Amino acid sequence: PLQSSIQEKILTARPGDYAVLSRGSQKFFFLIRQSSSEATWVEMSEFASLTQQEKKLVEQSSWKNAFHQLQKKVYLLRISKNPLMIFVLKNAQWMPLSEKDPLPFFVKILRLPLSPAPSHLIKYKTSLNGELITLPSSAWISVWPKDSSPLSEKNILIYFSNNERLAFPLWTSIDTPTGTVIIKTIEMGHQAASSYPALPNF
Numbered sequence: 001p002l003q004s005s006i007q008e009k010i011l012t013a014r015p016g017d018y019a020v021l022s023r024g025s026q027k028f029f030f031l032i033r034q035s036s037s038e039a040t041w042v043e044m045s046e047f048a049s050l051t052q053q054e055k056k057l058v059e060q061s062s063w064k065n066a067f068h069q070l071q072k073k074v075y076l077l078r079i080s081k082n083p084l085m086i087f088v089l090k091n092a093q094w095m096p097l098s099e100k101d102p103l104p105f106f107v108k109i110l111r112l113p114l115s116p117a118p119s120h121l122i123k124y125k126t127s128l129n130g131e132l133i134t135l136p137s138s139a140w141i142s143v144w145p146k147d148s149s150p151l152s153e154k155n156i157l158i159y160f161s162n163n164e165r166l167a168f169p170l171w172t173s174i175d176t177p178t179g180t181v182i183i184k185t186i187e188m189g190h191q192a193a194s195s196y197p198a199l200p201n202f
Contacts, residue, residue: 007079007110011040012167019168019188020063025049030168033194041199042077062127063187068195077106094200108145117141120157127189133171136162150177
């Protein structure tokens with residue numbers, strides 16, 4: 001009934017909205033750059049490690065404000081009624097992808113369904129940086145598609161702030177064969193500006 005999807009939920013975000021997600025050692029910076037009735041552009045930068053000297057800039061301010069000072073792959077997503085289009089940054093230009101390396105993974109995530117579900121955070125028997133799962137939240141159940149990966153048909157639990165103005169997830173937990181996996185949101189906020197080249201001109 002409140003059946004939604006990750007694409008639908010993220011399209012409620014506004015330009016300048018951002019979030020930093022963590023999967024152990026990996027860090028991903030998501031930024032909403034432009035939104036029209038026809039397309040929403042989302043930039044995604046990966047890091048796998050930060051300089052012990054660069055960790056100091058972040059604690060001293062924030063991911064958003066220290067970002068322009070970090071020594072990564074950079075993707076640009078154009079989300080529309082039409083099929084997803086992805087670009088990678090190569091020599092200061094947004095280059096289209098047809099070497100479908102991350103392309104199908106992204107489309108899967110965007111298609112993931114969301115329905116309301118009870119919290120399982122505990123088993124009983126502008127910027128915001130820190131332990132964001134302590135924010136007021138509600139849980140949403142999803143399931144990965146049947147496919148050729150360990151994630152195939154695995155259950156997903158995604159937490160979102162009760163404040164719809166915060167459109168990125170707070171916390172994502174996914175069953176796998178190795179055991180459960182947590183993608184943690186360590187910072188989210190508003191009014192971020194891209195450090196990368198301007199959007200493709202069509």
